[PDB]
């Protein structure tokens, strides 16, 4: 999947877990951004322990409707360096982690 947004804009990165398997426990959701490729965490949502946004995103990223099965965020005031692959990972037990990716491309205006 691919997204496009112009500099200065806000953009909504979708991430949901469906259909949660019966017997699978979900523990947290995490967004990562991949470089060359060497992942860094963007934001973490742990339903029990709360949210954490990592620099350089600390004011520009917010979970919209955070829950066990939703990690959708709004990435605000896009910059060129925000371009790249974004990975959303659910930590689950006993079956391990489940991911989805999206290429984001930021455009000049």
């Amino acid at each position: 999947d691919s997204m496009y947004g112009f500099i200065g804009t806000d953009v909504v990165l979708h991430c949901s877990f469906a259909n949660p398997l019966p017997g699978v426990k979900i523990t947290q959701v995490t967004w990562q951004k991949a470089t060359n490729g060497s992942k860094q965490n963007v934001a973490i949502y742990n339903p029990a322990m709360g949210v954490s946004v990592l620099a350089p995103y600390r004011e520009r990223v917010e979970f919209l409707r955070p829950s066990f099965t939703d990690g959708t965020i709004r990435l605000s005031r896009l910059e060129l360096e925000d371009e790249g692959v974004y990975i959303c990972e659910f930590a689950t037990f006993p079956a391990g982690n489940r991911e989805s990716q999206l290429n984001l491309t930021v455009m000049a205006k």
Binding site: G23, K25, T27, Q28, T30, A34, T35, G37, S38, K39, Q40, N41, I44, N46, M49, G50, S52, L54, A55, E89, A91, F93, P94, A95, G96, N97, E99, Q101
Partner: protein
């Protein structure tokens, strides 16, 4: 080869004892590189006779003596940190970080009032987990690319001790070994010594807070035995000499 089989699902295990878990903490991981003036860090060797074996990185660090010494200083508590790294030419990938605070020196290691969740390299955590004493590592059917040099750094009551493990996997990939996602992505990034020194290697930025040891063990064992792996009841200490 080459089929999944049915395994009773493991229960999510309760914590062994009562502690507070500190979430969403961060901090610069320190360099795994010592000054060249110092004597070589001790080296152990770990290898598998077969590609679908489990492989242990174990080297008893005599942590009880360190804790006995704190008791005789009548210390109330000690702190500890456990860190692992993959060492490559000029750089190291951080693999594991676990912080223990306000621990009881008259108990076995790790009886602490606070703990972080263990911070992991996501990829390593898919097939590897700490030993029961949390000072070694068990790898389940590791892929051949896991070969290399693994450094354990133990910070215990202010002492710091390094141990290197040379992992060799001549039997090749196991048919069900984890190889990573796309393309090709396996371990997190290898950082220069300078990056560690400049406090750039923030644990919350580059590693994943994950399940405590016994739950982590339950996930990997479940995955391992569903692919026909057998969990040995014990592992022997890793050896100080090279394999035949």
């Amino acid at each position: 080869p080459r089929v999944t089989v049915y395994v009773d699902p493991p229960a999510y295990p309760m914590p062994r004892y009562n502690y507070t878990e500190r979430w969403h903490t961060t901090g610069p991981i320190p360099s795994p590189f010592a000054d060249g003036r110092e004597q070589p860090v001790e080296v152990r060797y770990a290898t598998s006779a077969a590609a679908c074996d489990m492989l242990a990185l174990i080297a008893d660090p005599q942590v009880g003596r360190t804790l006995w010494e704190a008791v005789r200083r009548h210390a109330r508590a000690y702190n500890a940190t456990v860190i692992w790294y993959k060492i490559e030419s000029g750089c190291a990938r951080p693999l594991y970080y676990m912080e223990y605070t306000e621990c009881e020196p008259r108990k076995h290691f790790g009886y602490c009032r606070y703990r972080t969740p263990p911070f992991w390299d996501s990829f390593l955590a898919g097939f590897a987990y700490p030993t029961d004493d949390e000072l070694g590592l068990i790898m389940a059917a590791p892929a051949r690319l896991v070969e290399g040099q693994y450094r354990r750094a133990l910070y215990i009551d202010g002492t710091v001790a390094y141990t290197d493990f040379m992992v060799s996997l001549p039997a090749g990939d196991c048919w069900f070994s984890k190889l990573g996602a796309a393309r090709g992505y396996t371990f997190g990034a290898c950082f220069p010594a300078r990056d560690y020194e400049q406090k750039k290697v923030l644990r919350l930025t580059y590693l994943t807070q994950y399940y405590p040891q016994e739950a982590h063990k339950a996930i990997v064992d479940y995955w391992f035995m569903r692919h026909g792996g057998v969990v040995p009841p014990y592992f022997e200490e890793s050896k100080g000499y090279e394999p035949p």
